[PDB]
Design a protein around this ligand. Structure first.
Ligand SMILES: [Fe+3]
Ligand SMILES: [Fe+3]
Ligand SMILES: [Fe+3]
Ligand SMILES: [Zn+2]
Ligand SMILES: [Zn+2]
Ligand SMILES: [Zn+2]
Ligand SMILES: [Zn+2]
Ligand SMILES: [Zn+2]
Ligand SMILES: [Zn+2]
Ligand SMILES: [Zn+2]
Ligand SMILES: [Zn+2]
Ligand SMILES: [Zn+2]
Ligand SMILES: [Zn+2]
Ligand SMILES: [Zn+2]
Lengths: 178, 178, 178, 178, 178, 178, 178, 178, 178, 178, 178
């Protein structure tokens, strides 16, 4: 299935003899675990991206954005452990190495210094549009895979992402922001 | 659709060029937004009604009810901002002016001084029966409209309302309460 | 007198036989109670207005104003219960239904979506100028009516309103704010 | 003057050579100090009375009143030290011995066991009517004696007493309370 | 002895070779341990009974009793772990399975729905009379068995139980409570 | 017996039909209740005395003693309610009126202004010597009367009083303190 | 008027077009603003003076005074921002540069090292006598100028200053303090 | 008597003229004070020993024991000041110098590095067996010497020590712990 | 030396006989003390300047800067007492009178009302550049003078100042800020 | 220089005209910035590695290590922002994208599932040995480059890393850990 | 080397095979470890000495010194664990047995009862002069031994000790203190 990279129930290793997918069938785990690993990688990447833009912003919107990004991080950060632990509970092993983040995240972290407010905000709004829709879609997929438990987690994460999206989109809805 | 009064995505105004309904189709937004504006108006109206009855109660059940209403307010109050912000996140604009509260709320706030414990409690129980069922129904409607995120909010609000309903209904289940 | 709408000491109802105006003469109560009901309605209306403008603001001053309005609400909100309870203590019954808010408030809550920073701020500054002067005048009136106790409440509320006024007026004292 | 019992500025004792009435003339101190000693004695007596009624109440309103009296004590208790220290600051010496409490308080503490809810509440409402009016009157007297500072203290204490009065009066406004 | 059911020092099992009765002689342990197991079972049963009556109460004393029972639980709950751990420290093994609770508790948890305030309160007062006297008697027994340490625990638990008893007995000392 | 003034179990009044002495025999209650009423009156009197000396101290030890007395009050104050409630739980009714404090307290509250550090401290040390020994003796008496529960309370109060005694006695063990 | 140095409503500068005196007439602002600027300068100067004496005190009263001065600072410090912001709210601009502090304060900060307890305390008592009377007088002046709001602030500040005065005056009322 | 080393009531020194044994006879003080000085020295020594074993433990039980010892220290540490102050209150002077700790403690602090889990735990269990029995015995001795107050302290300390003993003894009741 | 104005070890005054420079040689103290007095004066002046600019800012960056300055004050304020107390510990006496602040500070507090954001920020950035470099240089000087202790303090203060500098410099790095 | 990848002072971009290296010469910045970017990347990588090992550990040391890793994260996590912000303050731009973490970190985050306690711990101890020595060396380098401020940060981070190293090394110093 | 007594890296024992001196050469460890063991012993001894003097002080400076010593303990106490753990992290084993404290501490704990304020304070000032200089010297030695990390710890401890020294020295700089 589509989550082999995150599946730990079939490993040829020590201290692994009991690992299983609990109440999920194999294909159901594959569906759910693909979502959890992707969203975990995406969340960690949003932390890193919000931090890089918070460190790099300059100009007259510095206080607006520097502080906002830290508030947004505070909202999303607890979901890192929550998503990873859910995956573990279902018989997965979460990936968090840089190369794995890059492969599985739907959000790319900047390698350049972006000083420009509009450039940062527009980039983040595009990211959050994708991530929020992703959580809505992934909630429905999990529920269909007989995992209402993970879906419930995603419903809350989507609400948070959708809120952050609104705020950022509002800031940039302004022709005076160059 | 049935939420035109709450829809902000089509306004002929400034700083509005980016407003949209995110991952909802137009008709889905109409369904969800009608619920959010109604429930927002209802919640604010329940705050005002619990306060007016808390200010006006007299007689030997004063402490019982004066204090209970404040506890109930504390439970429901955070949902005002939550519901309004959800609507905003979906491309709506929440109405909160007195005339709009009166139009869209399913709960009417008293204009008279009601001293009588039974009169207050029976009125509130009828309100909470409607509001709790409303949140259950609205959760199902939102889920059907591809908005499990708003539905999830409503599932928690219904639990709270249903709890308050029980307590009030219990108090008045007594022939010695005139 | 001018506070009949707020006077509960003469009602033909149950559990009301002890209600009186304490140490105030009837005309003194009328003077004081007119102020308390008006200011209560105005305070609740300022809550609703600050919230609607906080929900509706867009553009590059979003963080400035969205956050400021919530801070201002936090400052004024406790006075809702304080003013209502003072009225009750003096033998009044506070009005809080939407229709009563609309009738007695000196502040109107918007029915339209106002995205524009300057429009919001200028409107609020005009409101706060009236409300702050209102509390100063009402303090003097209460003291003259032999109610230094209510006057003392109003002296603190005026200080808060006058502070908020300054901040908002400062933000808009700028030709670069369109 | 009428506060000789509370005046410490003229004592024939040690460590007293600097004691004076600060910015008050002698007659102004006499006016203000009579109020402070009386209200101090009254406040301490209300603590003791609320406690004795809280310890002695029985019957089906036990929770209502037992808990309410403790809440009321919490509201009034800080004024004991505040009133005493104000008197000291003005060159007085506060009296707090039992015999002095009995002489100067406007509230009498019960010597009998009063089990009856109505008896307790009616007694307390009569006390609080007198004490609240007393603080209003004493505020005006202090202001007239060029002590707006003490008056300001009294304005807050009156508000608290008047609130407690309302609540107790409301509880007993009920023919079903025997 | 009379505590064989609670004695763990003589078991034919693993990881038990060091278990002993510390400074108590065997017969002293038997005396003390009979008290600890009984009181543990009784305490857990009072938790369950206070909860069932808190869940089941209806009528006009709902707030009085619903809230009081939770307060009483908060007072007694810490003694569950304390009593169990004391038993363990003395070389016992506490019983907490339903069948063991039923056997050793001096308090029976209702199997029926008791809506009636008086029925609940009278039942609880009879229980608390027995339990409070039980702790006084058990304190004396422990002290006589050279265990002043356990006695000291019981002296505090008795004070708490005796307080709760007073409050409940006071509420029902009223012919108007049917 | 010697506690008739504190005994509420035999009153000809309402809402008193259930009052009893719990697990104490009548003579045991008389012994214990005499101690509780006396110590309650003494504790309240120590509050009032520490406050009067804290308000009245002058000279170069002002900070030492002004602050110490407040710390000592904080230590003893909770025992007021504890002792009163214990008496109530045993079928007594605590006396707290000024005349009753004066009659039953072993500590007299000053009616004069005592500016002198040594005079205050020496007076308090004599009081605390009596009160601490009183609690030790009263603990033994309660234990002998089959009330180890009240004795346990007194053991803690004695420790506190004995600590305060030490500190005050240490301060005055100095020929340079005039 | 007498507050031209503090008046910002007539400046020839940017971002100042809206500045006004709110509900005060020009002469009323002049009266009130002279008081606010003077008291602001005085408060800041008392902070600096309490700190310099706290840093410089030596000898056997070190703990008494070192700690007391910090407590007194904690009491007065919040009034710095409060007084400055009140002035701003009324259309003033507060002065806080060293030269302005020196000009407008009624309290002088020492330039020498004062080790001597009595010298420090006597100096501070003279300062606090002036400052406390100043706040009483300034409260009356503000009320007469139709600014009960500022007067109310001053009534609280006077109470605090008068308390600190008492404590310091008490410490030095002692011939054994050299 | 057997506590001459801890007795301060007979010293030929300054500032000692008031020191006495309060309500204890000389021989009673000797009995009680021998216990307090010994237990003080023992408690301080247990702090030092738990710390040295917490600093020195190595191997696979590092987290178990490193963290447990700190928890145990937190439980016993407050008794250092409590025991010392009790001794002072009774006219003793507590010894805390290294040589005095070594002489009077019943627990020896290691001078060697003990890496081995079993060696540490077995040593501590032997210590805690002695110390817990010591507090039980010392409680009985104090009560017999007419000091129920100190006995009460010891009853609580014994419970704590006996709890720690259980936990440590449980950890080592295992043949797989080498 | 260059710190005679801050040196208290050679004064002809009372209570000064023990004052010395601890482990510093005279010339080392002179070096270190010149830095401490200068930095103390500078820190206090930055408090006053941040406050004056926070009180005086107007225009559309009001929230950005008004709030930022208060945050910056919170970061630097604790160093006032720390630097003064370090000087005292080394045998100095800190100067804090207005005239001394003006003489020794490297930062000048405005005497005019500066409404303009850019003017304020550019002024502060120049100040913070000097102050941050000053702390780095002063750390090296203190370490060379055998005072690594003061140097360590300065290393932390420099980090804070350098952070504030960055933020302010970022805000003004914008041609749209006039 | 060796920090070109982290240097932001020479960028051809917007809102960058003021960026500089503060009090550091160019070569000094290069030295310091190479350390800050490397240590930032290493710290973030240690977060990710501690989390992956905390998510993946299985077997009988699960609680030991799962909980320890979270404690270690809590200790190191604040240094992420601190190190990044220091770099920014010096005219750098921190890199945090996955590819940049991988390039500049001295710690590699696992891509495989490591269940084995010893494998995890030995890997981490090797990492922490390098990182702790790295901070010591980097502190010396920064001090030599005239940046005692950054060195001071590193001195604290080294202490933390060295502590964590000890604990982990202790756990694995055991032949019974396979 | 001079720290053999504190060196654990060469022991012939279990669970010690990995112990080493991290990034320090053997002679560097010897230098640093001699300081850590000495300062650990000294810190623990200052705890014990401050406590013994706090328990033993009598006379009119009782409150001054009793409370001050506890404040000073609170400042120094955390350094006990910090210094011990640093030693452990470097491959040492801290000594804390009484005999080891006595051998390695630079501060002697009294074996006699010292009632006299001046005697206590003068003794402590001599101790703190030595200990503060010791930390300054030891910081320099550690830095020279390539351990800036330990030096940094010592720089903070010296500041604390030097502060306490000042306060105590100030108290005794007074001929009226006998
Ligand atoms: Fe009730
Ligand atoms: Fe902004
Ligand atoms: Fe003193
Ligand atoms: Zn699988
Ligand atoms: Zn639409
Ligand atoms: Zn009327
Ligand atoms: Zn007089
Ligand atoms: Zn057995
Ligand atoms: Zn009786
Ligand atoms: Zn003007
Ligand atoms: Zn003796
Ligand atoms: Zn010098
Ligand atoms: Zn560069
Ligand atoms: Zn070695």
């Amino acid at each position: 299935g589509g989550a082999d990279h995150a599946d730990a129930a079939h490993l040829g290793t020590v201290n692994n003899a009991l690992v299983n997918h609990h109440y999920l069938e194999e294909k159901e785990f594959q569906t759910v675990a693909e979502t959890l690993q992707r969203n975990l990688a995406t969340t960690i990447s949003l932390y890193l991206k919000f931090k890089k833009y918070h460190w790099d912003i300059r100009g007259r919107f510095f206080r607006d954005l520097h502080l906002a990004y830290d508030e947004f991080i505070a909202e999303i950060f607890p979901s890192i452990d929550e998503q990873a632990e859910r995956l573990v509970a279902l018989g997965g092993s979460p990936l968090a190495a840089p190369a794995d983040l890059a492969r599985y995240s739907t959000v790319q972290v900047p390698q350049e210094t972006v000083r420009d407010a509009r450039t940062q905000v527009a980039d983040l709004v595009q990211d959050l549009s994708r991530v929020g829709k992703g959580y809505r879609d992934d909630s429905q997929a999990c529920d269909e895979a007989n995992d209402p438990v993970t879906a419930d987690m995603y419903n809350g994460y989507a609400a948070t992402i959708d809120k952050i999206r609104w705020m950022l989109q509002a800031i940039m809805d302004d022709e005076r922001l160059d």
